[PDB]
Amino acid sequence: CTASIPPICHXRWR
Numbered sequence: 507c508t509a510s511i512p513p514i515c516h517x518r519w520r
Contacts, residue, residue: 508514 507519
């Protein structure tokens with residue numbers, strides 16, 4: 507996933 511706050515993902519990703 508992304509190092510954001512909150513994080514940004516598309517389901518299942520680093």
